C-alpha cells in the first residue's frame, strides 16, 4: 500500500477469517478437518480435505437443512449444534470418511461450547476424532435442558413464534433418534 517494500498480509489474513498458524498445525495430522463454524442464527459442519487448488469438502451439514428431518425449533443453540454435527458426521461416514481433527477456526475453546457440541455430534456419527470428554457440555445441556429451565422463569414465552411455551428437549431426542436410524435419506 505505502510502497514497493510494503508487505500486505495474505488475503484470508486481511479478512481475518483464517488463522494460518493454527491451520498448519491442523494440517500436520494428515487427517481431514471437521470445520465447525457458527452464525448468529445457524451452525455449519464441514469435512474438508486438502487439495491442489484449494480445500475439498467431502461432506457437510447446515443447521438449516436440519428441518428436512423434522426440526421445528430455532437453529442457533446447543441441541441444534450437536445434531448438525451428527448429520455431517453421518454424511461423512457415507462418503468413506473415517477420521478427522476438529478445526474451530477463530472460535474460542470454551468448555461446553457449541463447536465442541458439533464435535461430539460427529463422534457419535461414528467418526474417530481426537477429543477430551470433560471439555464437552454435559448431556442435558446438549439436549437443550438449560433452555427449558430458562423458559420456566416464564411470564413471557422465551420463543416469539410458537414452537411451544416451555420448549422441548424431547424434540431433540426425536430428531437424534431419527438420524441414528439406518433408513434416513441423507
Amino acid at each position: 500500500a505505502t510502497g514497493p517494500r510494503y508487505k500486505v498480509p495474505m488475503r484470508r489474513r486481511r479478512e481475518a477469517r483464517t488463522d494460518y498458524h493454527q491451520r498448519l498445525r491442523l494440517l500436520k495430522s494428515g487427517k481431514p478437518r471437521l470445520v465447525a463454524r457458527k452464525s448468529n442464527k445457524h451452525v455449519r459442519a464441514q469435512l474438508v480435505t486438502l487439495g491442489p487448488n484449494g480445500d475439498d469438502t467431502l461432506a457437510s451439514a447446515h443447521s438449516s437443512d436440519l428441518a428436512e428431518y423434522g426440526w421445528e425449533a430455532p437453529t442457533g443453540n446447543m441441541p441444534s449444534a450437536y445434531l448438525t454435527g451428527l448429520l455431517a458426521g453421518l454424511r461423512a461416514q457415507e462418503a468413506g470418511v473415517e477420521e478427522a481433527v476438529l478445526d474451530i477456526g477463530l472460535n474460542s475453546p470454551t468448555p461446553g461450547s457449541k463447536v465442541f457440541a458439533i464435535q461430539e455430534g460427529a463422534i457419535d456419527a461414528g467418526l474417530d476424532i481426537p477429543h477430551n470428554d470433560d471439555v464437552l457440555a454435559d448431556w442435558q445441556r446438549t439436549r437443550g435442558a438449560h433452555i427449558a429451565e430458562y423458559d420456566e422463569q416464564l411470564e413471557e414465552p422465551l420463543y416469539s413464534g410458537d414452537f411451544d411455551a416451555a420448549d422441548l428437549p424431547e424434540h431433540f431426542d426425536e430428531l437424534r433418534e431419527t438420524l441414528l436410524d439406518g433408513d434416513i435419506e441423507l
Partner: protein, 95 residues
C-alpha cells in the same frame, strides 16, 4: 572466508525479498512427494526448521524415502553422493 560456519556468505540466499517477508503459506509445508520424484532444494527464509546446509541451495535431488515428516533426498555434490534430510517447506516439484 574469515569464518567457516554454516551461514558464512549466506546473506543473500537466506534473505527474503521484502514482499515475500512474513510467515509462509502452509500448503507447501505439507506437500507430499513420492520416492523417485525430482525435487528442487531451496530454503525458505521464513521457515526456521527442516533446513539443509545452505551450500546445497539450487540442487535438484531425488526423493528416496523419508524420516519422520522430513524427506530424505539424494543428490550429487560435485562427484560425491549425499543424502539430505529436508522438510517440504524447502522443496518444490520439478517441472
Amino acid at each position: 572466508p574469515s569464518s567457516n560456519g554454516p551461514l558464512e556468505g549466506t546473506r543473500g540466499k537466506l534473505k527474503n525479498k521484502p514482499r515475500d517477508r512474513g510467515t509462509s503459506p502452509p500448503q507447501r509445508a505439507v506437500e507430499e512427494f513420492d520416492d523417485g520424484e525430482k525435487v528442487h532444494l531451496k530454503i525458505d527464509p521464513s521457515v526456521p526448521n527442516g533446513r539443509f546446509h545452505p551450500r546445497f541451495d539450487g540442487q535438484t535431488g531425488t526423493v528416496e524415502g523419508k524420516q519422520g515428516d522430513a524427506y530424505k533426498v539424494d543428490i550429487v555434490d560435485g562427484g560425491k553422493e549425499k543424502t539430505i534430510i529436508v522438510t517440504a517447506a524447502h522443496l518444490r516439484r520439478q517441472e
